[PDB]
């Protein structure tokens with residue numbers, strides 16, 4: 001398992017947590033020196049448990065699919081909660097079976113569906129370490145509308161930060177004051193599958209993307225990523241979604 005404590009958290013302890021989370025995800029191969037996540041894992045091993053503690057020391061445990069870093073569900077005291085999607089229902093066959101009761105959330109886990117439930121796009125939701133403390137607190141007691149916004153925070157400050165060092169750094173700059181994510185952050189989130197795929201296609205194609213990926217850069221301008229020499233690939237992306245799952 002991996003763990004993170006908000007009580008006393010700072011850029012350094014958060015960086016250690018994100019390091020721990022990346023490290024918990026199995027791979028047999030690196031592509032362009034990036035860990036390539038597995039095509040599949042069978043059974044309960046496919047799920048990582050993340051124990052998160054709010055400032056008061058209250059906790060939830062979040063179940064993450066190790067093949068794609070997707071949040072499937074979470075446990076808060078004796079109640080488990082899972083997204084309304086088949087991969088989550090499958091996960092509920094393996095994790096938090098000890099819970100007194102299980103709630104299926106009234107949305108799936110994808111951004112569009114969560115934003116609808118939440119009533120705002122994530123462009124308008126501040127993220128940061130304080131926002132994460134709030135999200136854990138919220139998820140402690142069932143409220144599906146508030147839970148959708150908390151889950152948008154939780155997904156970006158955990159999974160998206162594991163995927164991209166730029167996102168991890170953005171959260172680090174937000175250790176003590178929340179801020180809506182940069183449009184570059186939004187762009188990388190939305191491009192993860194495409195980038196992972198193109199980085200994979202680049203082997204067998206001289207480091208060259210078969211199809212270019214358009215990102216917004218951390219200076220606000222729109223740009224094209226065409227090969228493995230881009231800073232996005234050499235320094236930023238930390239994990240590859242395997243093309244079998246794409």
Ligand SMILES: CC(=O)N[C@@H]1[C@@H](O[C@H](C)C(=O)O)[C@H](O)[C@@H](CO)O[C@H]1O
Nearest residue numbers: 070071083085087108109110111245
């Ligand atoms: C159309 C849709 O909802 N896609 C994915 C789901 O499926 C992926 C791509 C798959 O092919 O396994 C995934 O389970 C959820 C995670 O909660 O996020 C969505 O972005």
Ligand SMILES: *[C@@H]1O[C@H](CO)[C@@H](O)[C@H](O)[C@H]1NC(C)=O
Nearest residue numbers: 208225226227228229230231
């Ligand atoms: C490779 O990517 C670099 C970085 O943007 C770019 O300057 C160069 O034009 C690209 N080369 C090819 C062949 O795509």
